[PDB]
Design a protein around this ligand. Structure first.
Ligand SMILES: [Zn+2]
Ligand SMILES: [Zn+2]
Lengths: 99, 82, 85, 108, 148, 76, 94, 99, 83, 109, 93
DNA sequence: ATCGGATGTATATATCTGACACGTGCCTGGAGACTAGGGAGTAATCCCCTTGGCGGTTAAAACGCGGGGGACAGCGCGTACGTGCGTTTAAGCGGTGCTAGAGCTGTCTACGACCAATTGAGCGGCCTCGGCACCGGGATTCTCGAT
DNA sequence: ATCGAGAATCCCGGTGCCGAGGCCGCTCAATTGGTCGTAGACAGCTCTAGCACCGCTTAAACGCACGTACGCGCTGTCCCCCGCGTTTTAACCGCCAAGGGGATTACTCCCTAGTCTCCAGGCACGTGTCAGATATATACATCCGAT
């Protein structure tokens, strides 16, 4: 009696929705805290301009989007629809990031 | 001092990134690898950014330093200066 | 598709067109004027005054400029002008 | 062309010839800069900017908006083959990605 | 070549429909050289003034803009002392479809009211725009001293 | 007294001037006699430019003095 | 008051008005245009400098700029840009 | 009676032998003719220094070897031993050459 | 003295040798046409820039320096030929 | 130092310093060049060259030869970790490739 | 004729200093020349960029040090910076 | 589970040649001394904005459960590719001969750098009004269980 | 093959806000005008190396026949992400408050480019010699049918 969508028919709706929007997808404070942690690991007592954090978020999001696109391509090439970590390392190695 | 902030990149965030990338189904072990690669990329960028900041005898990492490091790495960015 | 002789002529040359091309601004005139304008003029339609470089790039690489339907009509209607030209 | 007027109007361009000339001369590119270089450079820059902006405006009009936003720039750059080849390694801030979904993932 | 034929259609069209208050003709046998005469418009301080213009046509016409020069001296904000003319049509808005009659009538219109956006000479520019009477009677005395 | 002004082409024009005369009136007379605009002329005398508010006696122009005429043309 | 900072705002706005007579540009897209113009100018100038140093010359003649454009740009854009530059310089000299 | 090896042993022998060696693996004359043809397509009446041809051959060989390594890695990822044209296409697509 | 269809000069055993150096064990039958196409594309890309360099310098003979500079511009630096 | 010997000898290097100074000045890198930069640059160049030469010589000796051919240089560059990262996009003429075979392709038991 | 310069003799000196036995062939010498030139161009370009970034019209040693830190990987960069600092300290006195 | 070919690979020894190491003449680029002025270091001051915090409120995350579709393993097949052999083909090596064109040299003419005045293009600051954000209502269209 | 109920998405209209375009004042750099030391364009000469040809090999390419092993498809099993409802949590907006440090200006001083003069470090060239490639003859590792 209750109405439930079949598995996988709402994921495509999410794909269609998210490829239409442009806003960021990672919450601001967690990313800012992570950036501050890494920076203070490198050199202590640093201050960040807000524009720098925004630029870092844009770059990280674009890089991850590209990586996931290539991972999905590899997973499809392996006659599957699910992305697995081995796809991620294969794509990264072919791109030359780790060799 | 801060610790264990990599968990701030939550599972729904990686899910949304995959959904934008064009992914229908995600395995359960993707998230750890995604967090690892994100940490590696962030470390690589911040090293150059902090080096640029420290060279100029400053103390604040302006957006110009970050965009300049990104341009050096081969990932040129438009919008925040340059 | 104009049977009239006068309307057919090139807006600049004042004679019958040779191997015409149709602009996205729905303006028709002979190709040598287009070549001369792209080399020397402002790379825009003299009347419309809006740039068409993007359209020209898209159409040029596959030689999409040539228009067969407007080609056939001009010699089938007015052969002697084509022959003398 | 007739002399004794502004340089940018002698060539019929809108980009500043003098500023480009100063940038070339003091930009640590070469010991001497010719007099014909800045005009050529300004013309090339103007042509490229006009080419980008025409497609951006077309996309904005197709998207019912009358003001160009970075999403329109992303659409215009990525949809054209030549410009995408030129800007292969460049990321536009807040532009999203092109709508594209693999054929295999589509429902049967 | 084609420029000769184009200029021939130009002479035919200007002869069949002569422009009002402006008339041009071939100064010599050479087809490119032209002499034109313009009469001062009624709604102007240029009453009683007849002016002669010399016209040179480049080889590529109308594919390149033509050249015009003032034989006489006219006190206008957009005209140099030696006879240069500053119009955006002649160097910036030239188009092959544009013809020779409307450039002359545009020059006449400029003589009716000058354009202060791009002053050829700042002195005459603020003579014009600071006060009307200044420009009016100086242009008067100019048109009696030279045109008449 | 009377002075001479040599143009850029070498042409020499005689001028009837006085130490108490005004610059604008003299420039207007030059315009009437020659056609060159009044203030578009640049007058050079012993390497010093001439100011509209200044007088002839201020710059010490004597009789039979030769000035240099410079044309300032902009636009085209 | 803050110090002056040069930018290509006015010229890009003029070109936009020339192309589309009734469309404005946001601030972010304006900055993106400015950055893109700077990037392309840096690329062309650097290529021209290296190419002129390769032949033991000293001046960046318009020939070097033309060859740098023909190298950097793709097939069709290079041809159109060379045509535009040659036309502009020929108009400028005469 | 005749002694013939199992399919897949002398291939491994070739793999071991060629990786140790360093000589050029393409005939000089056909490659030179191909280079001359491609060049004369662009501009007519060119003359080639021998060093130019040698450098071009070295670059082409290195590029092809790298592409074949990546193709083999993709094929092994797809749970196969044979390399197939779709594997080359995928490797080029990931590397960003085809775009 | 023009040349024709010389892409067949890259023989099947040559591509097999290159693949063996790469480290492959079994080769499909359709690899050779794809390899020939890829090789032709790469050669065209390099030769265009080399010819541009040799044409700018008002010369008529391509040299090692032109090819090396073209490769360096394309992103594959080459040692062992000067520069 | 004593300021009496040659600049390279004064700084205790083998690479030239005057030649590096001339290259920096005539190289169109800056309007002005400091008096300490060429020494630093020569030192860095010498250190990198020394490291690569040491590795190449070790590889050649392990192969029982008395001359460093390009193959030994290629082996030294590839086997080392940081040098491989530094020269990832460099092709060495007549350098061959490192020997490796994927574990899957090996014969079964 | 004309003279062409190279880093051949200095590389040979370094080789003799490190391995006093092994000789080096011609092609290896050309490869080392190309490597030295490439590294020099990279470091000089990075130093010039850093100098222009802060509106500086000169290239001091610290620009070279920062360029070395930016370019080379970790251990190599640290050792190179140590070597350069030692050379500058010894040269200045 | 090895056994015995049988193949290919690795090892030891003479040899002879061409590439590598070294000496030589010298000349052009590197070094030493003196000058001048602008670029950079340093002290003092402003106010921009970055860190820190507090209250709420609500969108987003964490959690758990039913299950259906996808990952993975096993089995059969027949077709494509490896392996080997005899045959046809053109790469490779040596030697010769011709000359187009790279490379160098000397003149001098015109293009570009420096210098001073000067003024108009462009930049900083203010302001206002319309395009876009947003909300509420309705119309349209995918979607799935049941036939 | 479809009808129908339910849910997500698009159209349309009204309300409100802030930032984008235009205007005003002003400081600085672009333009003009002239002069001057030299970059390279051009003509002429030289001789290197690239192109073309020929002959004779002999290694490599080719086509064919046979066998076999693996890519692919089918089937089944099971288990683990997905979709949805409920609960816990901190992101985010708005606000206030301080002072650290980026940004600016003025002053001084000393580092380096320019110039001239002199001299030896490194390059083109020529020469002697041994490191290694080549050929020939054994010793041994490894593969394959079959016990
Ligand atoms: Zn026509
Ligand atoms: Zn039109």
């Amino acid at each position: 009696k209750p109405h439930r969508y079949r598995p996988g028919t709402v994921a495509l709706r999410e794909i269609r929705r998210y490829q239409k929007s442009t806003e960021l997808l990672i919450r601001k404070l967690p990313f800012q805290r992570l950036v501050r942690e890494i920076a203070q690991d490198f050199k202590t007592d640093l201050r960040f301009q807000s524009s720098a954090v925004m630029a870092l978020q844009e770059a990280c999001e674009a890089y991850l989007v590209g990586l996931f696109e290539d991972t999905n391509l590899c997973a499809i090439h392996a006659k599957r629809v699910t992305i697995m970590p081995k796809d991620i390392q294969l794509a990264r190695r072919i791109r030359g990031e780790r060799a | 001092v801060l610790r264990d902030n990599i968990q701030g990149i939550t599972k729904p965030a990686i899910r949304r990134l995959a959904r934008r990338g064009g992914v229908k189904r995600i395995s359960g072990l993707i998230y750890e690898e995604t967090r690892g690669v994100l940490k590696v990329f962030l470390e690589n960028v911040i090293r150059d950014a902090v080096t640029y900041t420290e060279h100029a005898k400053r103390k604040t990492v302006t957006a110009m330093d970050v965009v300049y490091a990104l341009k050096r790495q081969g990932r040129t960015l438009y919008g925040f200066g340059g | 598709a104009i049977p009239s002789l006068s309307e057919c002529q090139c807006g600049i040359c004042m004679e019958i067109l040779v191997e015409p091309v149709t602009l996205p601004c729905n303006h028709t005139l002979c190709k040598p004027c287009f070549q001369s304008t792209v080399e020397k003029a402002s790379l825009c339609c003299p009347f419309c005054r809006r740039r068409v470089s993007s359209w020209t790039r898209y159409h040029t690489r596959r030689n999409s400029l040539v228009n067969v339907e407007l080609w056939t009509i001009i010699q089938k209607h007015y052969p002697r002008e084509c022959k003398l030209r | 062309s007739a002399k004794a007027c502004t340089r940018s109007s002698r060539a019929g361009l809108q980009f500043p010839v003098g500023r480009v000339h100063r940038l070339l001369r003091k930009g640590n590119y070469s010991e001497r800069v010719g007099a014909g270089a800045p005009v050529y450079l300004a013309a090339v820059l103007e042509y490229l900017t006009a080419e980008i902006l025409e497609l951006a405006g077309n996309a904005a009009r197709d998207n019912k908006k009358t003001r160009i936003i970075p999403r329109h720039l992303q659409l215009a750059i990525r949809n054209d083959e030549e410009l995408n080849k030129l800007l292969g390694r460049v990321t536009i801030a807040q532009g999203g990605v092109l709508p594209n979904i693999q054929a295999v993932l589509l429902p049967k | 070549h084609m420029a000769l034929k184009r200029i021939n259609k130009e002479l035919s069209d200007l002869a069949r429909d002569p422009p009002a208050q402006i008339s041009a003709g071939p100064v010599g046998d050479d087809m490119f050289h032209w002499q034109a005469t313009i009469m001062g418009p009624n709604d102007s301080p240029y009453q009683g003034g007849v002016f002669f213009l010399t016209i040179h046509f480049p080889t590529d016409y109308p594919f390149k803009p033509p050249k015009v020069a003032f034989t006489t001296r006219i006190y206008h904000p957009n005209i140099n002392s030696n006879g240069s003319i500053c119009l955006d049509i002649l160097r910036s808005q030239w188009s092959p479809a544009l013809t020779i009659s409307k450039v002359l009538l545009s020059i006449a219109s400029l003589l009716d009211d000058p354009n202060p956006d791009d002053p050829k000479v700042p002195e005459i520019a603020r003579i014009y725009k600071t006060d009307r009477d200044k420009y009016n009677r100086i242009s008067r005395e100019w048109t009696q001293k030279y045109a008449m | 007294m009377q002075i001479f002004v040599k143009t850029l082409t070498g042409k020499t024009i005689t001028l009837e001037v006085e130490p108490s005369d005004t610059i604008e009136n003299v420039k207007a007379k030059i315009q009437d006699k020659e056609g060159i605009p009044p203030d578009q002329q640049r007058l050079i005398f012993a390497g010093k430019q001439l100011e509209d508010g200044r007088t002839l006696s201020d710059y010490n122009i004597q009789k039979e003095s030769t000035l240099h005429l410079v044309l300032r043309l902009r636009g085209g | 008051k803050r110090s002056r900072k040069e930018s290509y705002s006015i010229y890009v706005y003029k070109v936009l008005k020339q192309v589309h007579p009734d469309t404005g540009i946001s601030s972010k897209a304006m900055g993106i245009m400015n950055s893109f113009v700077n990037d392309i100018f840096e690329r062309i100038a650097g290529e021209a400098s290296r190419l002129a140093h390769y032949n033991k010359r000293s001046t960046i003649t318009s020939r070097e700029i033309q060859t740098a454009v023909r190298l950097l740009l793709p097939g069709e854009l290079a041809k159109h840009a060379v045509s535009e530059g040659t036309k502009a310089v020929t108009k400028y000299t005469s």
